[PDB]
Ligand binder design. Structure first.
Ligand SMILES: O=C(NC[C@H]1O[C@@H](n2ccc(=O)[nH]c2=O)[C@H](O)[C@@H]1O)c1cccc(CO[C@@H]2O[C@H](CO)[C@H](O)[C@H](O)[C@@H]2O)n1
Ligand SMILES: O=C(NC[C@H]1O[C@@H](n2ccc(=O)[nH]c2=O)[C@H](O)[C@@H]1O)c1cccc(CO[C@@H]2O[C@H](CO)[C@H](O)[C@H](O)[C@@H]2O)n1
Ligand SMILES: CCCCCCCCO[C@@H]1O[C@H](CO)[C@H](O)[C@H](O)[C@H]1O[C@@H]1O[C@@H](C)[C@@H](O)[C@@H](O)[C@@H]1O
Ligand SMILES: CCCCCCCCO[C@@H]1O[C@H](CO)[C@H](O)[C@H](O)[C@H]1O[C@@H]1O[C@@H](C)[C@@H](O)[C@@H](O)[C@@H]1O
Ligand SMILES: [Mn+2]
Ligand SMILES: [Mn+2]
Lengths: 289, 289
């Protein structure tokens, strides 16, 4: 569980934090609303692992594999096994229209997988968007009783390096790899005032990627419910946001600030963007098309 | 209240956060367990004020004025009125053995003061230490029903600049002004293994000041209860920690990491330490003796 009585940490030996030395000199490591921005060098994973293990934390990972995207599951799950929350309780939730096409991946102890059969929409845009409805529906069902945190990701990806408890917080978004260095005017927010996702050119903190968000079950339920309801209003008004669920995610996170923001280490495409000096690790990356 | 359903922030116009520009290049702004370290330049107070006002946050401020220390109350309260949580609901709790010696200070709207009569101990050390017992006792009483957060400070001080909602979090400590640049071996932790406050020379993150700590009512109750019980064990074993309540505070915060750490802007002595370049503001300072 979360916010529960917490026992004392054991004696630990680690380097003393240096008050007069910035942990990074090249990047912003805290938002103006005092949310950590997670980069390599900002955290001691040993301290964090202790804190979260002592709370017997369970992390749910949601992934949608509809139609041809079932092909991405084998690599996704195999690499998650080597890099995602290793040492902690993990529950994978695979949403699919083809339960029989889910590969039999060998899981480490304390880790489990559930196949959730859902309907397949025709348009790739609707498949992508209706994740919000499907996540919200299963929150008020399975997730509240089974996991402490939910992490919601795209399937056409692989883990290449550590993704662990440093990301866990009531509500998080991830800096989109294409726009972390862009000015807000250049962000591809929905710009039509007729849409619920609308953000004016003088507003916005970051451009968050639709491919990687999460938080506590309660906060993820709230986010997904709000995005789905906003998308239903748009549909009733005959408008579809420029970047679909991602546009609505960005509107939500503008109005409800995330309690952590993940750096582009956590959402990357090496083929398109290379490997900049600013990224000490590439953790979760696009699969070459 | 806290952790309650939160409505959307309104449209706000402010400078875009700069991902590729550190907010400070001279100091550590986040702990290795991902707690913000609060310095000027790390936060946008307009965003934070919005977030906390929308939750109708009430802050309790505890202060002990025993025996001759009643003389410090007038300046303490007057300066708190100009700098402490202005715009938010504030409840001052003045613990004293002389209710009649509490000065009549004019308060802004939405701010109130309660005088709590307590016994005066002979030794200044016991007066200082027994704050832990007295805060814990009043938590399980008044504080839980009246405030969302508690801030616990020394009285022989004055506010000189903004102390606001940027400090609020489940549990916070403050970097002691004498030791923020010191190595852990030099910290004046309790070093005798016979004391409950004992910390070995290879452990410790920071040296926190006993003069400024706080958090949610629940977390402050836990801290104060734990420190009082540890002090009672020490007394039974015929040992008194080198720096009294401060030694126990440091042991507690080592084993239960704070969710924010305040910079020495929030706890300073200009007479003894001057005004270093690293401090852009002096917010809460010792009164010249
Ligand atoms: O990633 C995409 N869509 C978001 C997610 O939505 C799910 N999806 C989308 C379309 C689809 O047919 N099947 C799916 O399962 C997958 O989990 C995808 O990762 C996507 C959409 C169009 C083109 C590309 C190319 O990269 N990706
Ligand atoms: O600040 C001191 N003690 C911690 C707090 O403990 C409370 N105290 C202490 C002794 C006392 O006689 N009366 C008090 O009210 C005051 O709120 C003090 O701020 C202190 C103790 C000894 C010497 C000095 C000189 O500065 N300060
Ligand atoms: C000025 C520099 C402009 C260059 C910016 C290049 C990144 C573009 O990124 C696309 O951004 C869109 C929002 O505007 C959507 O999020 C889309 O899903 C994404 O493409 C996805 O993520 C990408 C990283 C790739 O993996 C692509 O194949 C994916 O479909
Ligand atoms: C290497 C540089 C060594 C120089 C360090 C100088 C700061 C010493 O600080 C004292 O530290 C003690 C712990 O070791 C206690 O917290 C004590 O209350 C505090 O004095 C208090 O706070 C001070 C800031 C002064 O206001 C003093 O008058 C107070 O009694
Ligand atoms: Mn994709
Ligand atoms: Mn003092």
């Amino acid at each position: 569980a979360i916010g529960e009585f917490m026992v004392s940490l054991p004696r630990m030996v680690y380097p003393q934090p240096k008050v007069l030395t910035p942990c990074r000199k090249d990047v912003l490591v805290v938002t103006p609303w005092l949310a950590p921005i997670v980069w390599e060098g900002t955290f001691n994973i040993d301290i964090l692992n202790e804190q979260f293990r002592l709370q017997n934390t369970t992390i749910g990972l949601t992934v949608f594999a509809i139609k041809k995207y079932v092909a991405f599951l084998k690599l996704f799950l195999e690499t998650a096994e080597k890099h995602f929350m290793v040492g902690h309780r993990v529950h994978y939730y695979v949403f699919t229209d083809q339960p029989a096409a889910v590969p039999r991946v060998t899981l480490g102890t304390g880790r489990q997988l559930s196949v959730l059969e859902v309907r397949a929409y025709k348009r790739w845009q609707d498949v992508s968007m209706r994740r919000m409805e499907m996540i919200s529906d299963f929150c008020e069902r399975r997730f509240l009783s089974e996991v402490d945190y939910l992490v919601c990701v795209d399937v056409d990806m692989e883990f290449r390096d550590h993704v662990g408890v440093e990301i866990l917080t009531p509500l998080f978004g991830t800096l989109h790899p294409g726009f972390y260095g862009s000015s807000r005017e250049a962000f591809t927010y929905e710009r039509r005032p007729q849409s619920q996702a609308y953000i004016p050119k003088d507003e916005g903190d970051f451009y968050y990627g639709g491919a990687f968000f999460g938080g506590s079950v309660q906060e993820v339920q709230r986010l997904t419910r709000a995005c789905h309801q906003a998308m239903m209003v748009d549909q009733a008004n005959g408008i579809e946001a420029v970047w679909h669920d991602e546009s609505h995610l960005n509107k939500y996170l503008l109005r409800h600030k995330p309690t952590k923001v993940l750096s582009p280490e956590y959402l990357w495409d090496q083929q398109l963007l290379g490997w900049p000096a600013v990224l000490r690790k590439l953790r979760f990356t696009a699969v070459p098309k």
